[PDB]
């Protein structure tokens, strides 16, 4: 086509989606990770995660307001990944890298799994 | 913080949100523009438009499944702007610029209004 493109549009959209999440506006699901609960937008979770994409395209699970993750999932690792979904920024540290990588593998977030593998390989 | 950032994350999220729109997945509103209907995600419309942000933060309108726009709004201009919201690409042409600018002013999409004003000024 002959379209023009606004370079900062995708980033501005994601910033506003994160502002809606922070104010709990139009959040339609709560993700339960052991004793912890995280409110989010199903569309953003699907757009970021192969696992959530599979869950919310399922004809019965698409209607659930609560999703319980596997008990082996670490709440902090999930929190870090949820923040990444809404911001593009990943808080990867020596103390959380193993939990973040395991959570990213479970959530099917291949670019996160990739950077965790590379950061671990460099420390070996 | 000491976060790392994935450059293509925001663009990848928006691409997936557009794929969900194309397959009518988790769309929660229909925008009526005279004889034409457009399905969308309320969160994306709010993230892109000052008008939709005001509508869907309203305690009664947040629950509506149908929103009717002002009869002066051109369906093609709306279609072009809805495509821009979900892609960052604006199909701006001599034949649609006036309708696109008027629709962007109504929807409160200031960056679109700005490029339309500049393109019009150059042709004068």
């Amino acid at each position: 086509d002959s379209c023009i493109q606004f370079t900062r549009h995708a980033s501005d959209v994601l910033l506003n989606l994160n502002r809606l999440r922070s104010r709990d506006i139009l959040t339609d699901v709560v993700i339960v990770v052991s004793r912890e609960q995280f409110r989010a937008h199903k569309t953003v979770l699907m757009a970021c995660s192969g696992l959530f994409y599979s869950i919310f395209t399922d004809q019965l699970k698409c209607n659930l307001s609560v999703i319980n993750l596997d008990p082996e999932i670490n709440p902090e690792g999930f929190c870090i990944l949820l923040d990444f979904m809404y911001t593009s920024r990943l808080n990867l540290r020596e103390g959380n890298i193993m939990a973040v990588m395991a959570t990213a593998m479970y959530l099917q977030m291949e670019h996160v799994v990739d950077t965790c593998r590379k950061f671990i390989k460099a420390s070996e | 913080d000491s976060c790392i950032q994935f450059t293509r994350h925001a663009s990848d999220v928006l691409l997936n949100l557009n794929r969900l729109r194309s397959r009518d997945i988790l769309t929660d509103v229909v925008i009526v523009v005279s004889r034409e209907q457009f399905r969308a995600h309320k969160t994306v419309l709010m993230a892109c438009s000052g008008l939709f942000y005001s509508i869907f933060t309203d305690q009664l309108k947040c629950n509506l499944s149908v929103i009717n726009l002002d009869p002066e709004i051109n369906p093609e201009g709306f279609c072009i702007l809805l495509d821009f919201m979900y892609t960052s690409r604006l199909n701006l042409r001599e034949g649609n610029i006036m309708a696109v600018m008027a629709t962007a002013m109504y929807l409160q999409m200031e960056h679109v209004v700005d490029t339309c004003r500049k393109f019009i000024k150059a042709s004068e």
């Binding site: 379209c3 023009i4 493109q5 606004f6 370079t7 | 690409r89 604006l90 960056h111 490029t115």
Partner: peptide, 4 residues
């Protein structure tokens, strides 16, 4: 704005 750019030519993509």
């Amino acid at each position: 704005w750019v030519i993509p």
